[PDB]
Amino acid sequence: KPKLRFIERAPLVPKVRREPKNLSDIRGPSTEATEFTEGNFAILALGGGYLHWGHFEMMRLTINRSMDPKNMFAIWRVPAPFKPITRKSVDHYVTPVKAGRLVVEMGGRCEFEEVQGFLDQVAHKLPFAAKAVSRGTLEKMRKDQEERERNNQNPWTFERIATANMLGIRKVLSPYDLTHKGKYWGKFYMPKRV
Amino acid sequence: VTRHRRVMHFQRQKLMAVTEYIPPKPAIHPSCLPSPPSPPQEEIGLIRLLRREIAAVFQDNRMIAVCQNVALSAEDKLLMRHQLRKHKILMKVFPNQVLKPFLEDSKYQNLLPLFVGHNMLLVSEEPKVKEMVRILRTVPFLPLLGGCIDDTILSRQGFINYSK
């Protein structure tokens, strides 16, 4: 079945049972679906956001049309829209997404460049930052980022100050920054920052 | 978690500016340093294969002539091969970039100036110059550059002097 499965709009049986609290599902690094499973090329979410049903049907009409069942296949990585949005008088469900989450996964007997051609076009139309990534680019990006902390010539880093409360600066810092290390801010995420 | 970039506090803004990444800078830009020696490349299968047949062509057959394969349509080239095939002449061409080493280390280094651009090698057994200069007489824009009559280097008139 080398095609994207039909995605419904609203859950058939509303299962509004919430596991934690709200508004914490966009901030912070992704904890699930971070590595590659049974695939080689995917799209990486470089920031948090919400996926509305139109985005899911967008995935259908831009990937499947540029798809051949003979040599290519793709599947879903993000779940179906389960979190609704209330709408007062002047509704619909979305999927929470964190930075680093993998949206869809692709693979087959093909190289990255061919899959890159259409994947980047889809990547630019998500509400958050995203880019096409392969099994080599991701590790190269992670190793390149890891190299930054070792050749850095700045004696002062975010972790050396936030954890130690250097300038009494935890007064203006959130407690969530002890793990965010200063690379995350709200729903945004900057890979370029050490 | 906002959608308007969540404008930063001044104290936090100064913290990020101070803790920005600083790449290491070399004393000399590596680009202006005596580059490391270039690594030699492994010889591919084609180069060794052509050399042994270039040597075999050079030794088995008495006649080796130098010509230039000027711009010509395939049909005209095919018939030119055909008009040479009627007098048991076989046509062979080799890449010039690899002919340069094979000719300079041997006795036949005198043919290096001939081989610069597009070249055509006319190879035949029991040479008979009269027939193929007639075939080049009907074609005015195909010139004979030279060659060797049994390892005797001669120019175009040398081929003509042998014809009669």
Binding site: E111, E113, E114, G117, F118 | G45, L46, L49
Partner: peptide, 23 residues
Amino acid sequence: SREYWRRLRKQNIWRHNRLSKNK
């Protein structure tokens, strides 16, 4: 040999043909 590299060249154009599918 000659036939080995002729096949190898045939693979290269096959690779380039696929790379131009999404071009």
